[PDB]
Design a protein around this ligand. Sequence first.
Ligand SMILES: *Cc1c(COP(=O)(O)O)cnc(C)c1O
Ligand SMILES: *Cc1c(COP(=O)(O)O)cnc(C)c1O
Lengths: 405, 405
Amino acid sequence: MKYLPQQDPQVFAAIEQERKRQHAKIELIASENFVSRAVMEAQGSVLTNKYAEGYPGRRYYGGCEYVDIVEELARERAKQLFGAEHANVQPHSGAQANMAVYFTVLEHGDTVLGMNLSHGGHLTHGSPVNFSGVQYNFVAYGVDPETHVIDYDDVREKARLHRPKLIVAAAAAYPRIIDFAKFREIADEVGAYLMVDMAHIAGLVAAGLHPNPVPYAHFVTTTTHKTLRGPRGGMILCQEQFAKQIDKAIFPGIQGGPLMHVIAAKAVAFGEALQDDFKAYAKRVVDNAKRLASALQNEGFTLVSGGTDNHLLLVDLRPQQLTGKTAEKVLDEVGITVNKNTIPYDPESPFVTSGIRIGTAAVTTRGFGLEEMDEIAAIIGLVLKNVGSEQALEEARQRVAALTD
Amino acid sequence: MKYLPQQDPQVFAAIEQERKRQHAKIELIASENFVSRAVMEAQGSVLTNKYAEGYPGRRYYGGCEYVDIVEELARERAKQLFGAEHANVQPHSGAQANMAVYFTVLEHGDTVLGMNLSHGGHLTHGSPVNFSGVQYNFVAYGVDPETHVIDYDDVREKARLHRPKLIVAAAAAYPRIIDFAKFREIADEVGAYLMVDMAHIAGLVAAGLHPNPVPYAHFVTTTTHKTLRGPRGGMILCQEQFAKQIDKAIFPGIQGGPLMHVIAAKAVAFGEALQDDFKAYAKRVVDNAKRLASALQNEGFTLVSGGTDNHLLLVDLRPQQLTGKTAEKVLDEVGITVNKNTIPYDPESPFVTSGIRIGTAAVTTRGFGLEEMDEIAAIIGLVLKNVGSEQALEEARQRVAALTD
Ligand SMILES: *Cc1c(COP(=O)(O)O)cnc(C)c1O
Ligand SMILES: *Cc1c(COP(=O)(O)O)cnc(C)c1O
């Protein structure tokens, strides 16, 4: 940076602390990643100066010729990446992408069926403190108590009983492949739309390492960040038949001016994802997750669903008589970043929990591989089996430092 | 830029076109501005990598120590700038700031009283194609047919007849000072909350050149861009008594993860606004607007309300037998950027209009002063009085080029 250090020492000092923190810590929060310098440059551009309400070639303001090129690059690259008929790259966030889809097909108080929040569902899939749970009548399907895999007969029964207008598939904390064909079959049986919220797995979908929801879903929502490794923001994919309605839902429906600089950064990220090396990256993410899962089991940890098919895993800490909160806290002391997370049928509140969620997208971006997964698992074992030993925690701290340099 | 040109030639070429366009054109769109290099650097930072759902010291994820410093810098600087008891700097946009306030105090179908959209009100103040008009029962107050100033007796009568839960004051296209004391008096009479949407005038408020709504309003919403000259995004100000509810409305209410890099940029912009030179800038904005208004009247143009108290003016084109659409188009041909805009009691649709809206915030940032205002007015006169003369348009084009170098 050149101008920020002189103009705002306080803000610069804090940013520099954060940059150094990002390097020093082992980031295992499953939603996190590190974007490229090109992506950052794009959103640090003069495009922040441009109002561009509307869509390419159909804007409310003049002078949009070049931001139109940028937005269409984003849309076309997204369509190639996911094989979708339409893309809307304007959502400010994953939350706003979902909000727009809900606004498109639902009336206030309509019934929606989503994944149980305590089993892996997202806040925006019907939390009573979120707009989704307040505005619409959410009901939940669950995972099997033993296998922790989505119970598709429960999805079907809930759908047939409650007759939802919309079914939501997709999760914030589900370690297995989701069967979108079955979701669509159930949706078809009850005459409901299917929305897939692929935020966590979008990068894996792009790389062909998770089944693509696009052919099965009426609407697909996603973050552009997370496994897709893009700038912070949202996106909606859908068939041509819903394009006009979806576009109107985003604007003038729920948003105002789009963030054109962030949209530029989205284009950059989609460009990166189209490359062969991104596919190699995404395979390492999945390989690393399997390896880490196996290595954690080797340490004696129990994993929700017995492993992982994707970038993320959930440790059930009950065998160690630990809460997620306790584990999260002690790992923070040694430089490993995780988050506490409810496990299916958790006896604890969502604020304490019996689990920690772990993902490999961030460490993989940093170039970590299988050997590093083994060591990460060994450090976690050392820490969680010795929570009262400062000597053990110091050893862990040093081993974490050795990994990050 | 260093990395973007190599990684993504297509995106870079388009960004460069936009940057050159921003320099070449005379930007008179009233909502537009040019942010500092420091602001851009802040939002081009690694803070995009951090999930920070929640609030400073009360986050859902670990590792937020430094983004907490950034967010608190934003909040504290906003509070000093506007004398507010609480700030929420997380809204993704002006639309989301409004959405959050509505979510805080209103139930689905509650009555809200806002400014007539065709008289200066914003889309998010009850358009039937916007969430506001769909989710809530909006009624409108108008401006006087002759003076084009808000008719405060009409505000009062509408309030007393319709008994709104919330009254909204603030505008996208109103050239005069708004009397917030009168709005609060009316709100008090009918037991309604008062929300002031100060997006357009926030920079002028910060500089003490427009009365501050903060002491009179329960809630104040704003963009961080526009006259405040910050990054693209939103903000809410309110008294301590609504702080917890407002914060919950933003998260987990309507948004997910905040844009921490944009919040850093907000802090930078607020820092800039706190400086003496920003106050000088804002006075030049207002001075320039008056001068431009006077110079346009000298050219024979009629202005809505007969002039301006702020950064913006509206030309009533009916005396010239021109629509806003026609004027917008021909000005685009010579390098002057305006937008068509409905005038109060417009005989034309909002898609054709009888007016153009003009603001001075952008040209003032570029260092334009009174002499430039005279010339801009003279060029507009030349163009709009000679719409069928290619020679006149070429002269205008050359004169525009002389202004921008
Ligand atoms: C992360 C996530 C979201 C929310 O995205 P934000 O950008 O944080 O608003 C929504 N749904 C799912 C499944 C997610 O994983
Ligand atoms: C610009 C504006 C908005 C919307 O802000 P976005 O960032 O475009 O969503 C809302 N209200 C008023 C009065 C505005 O001027």
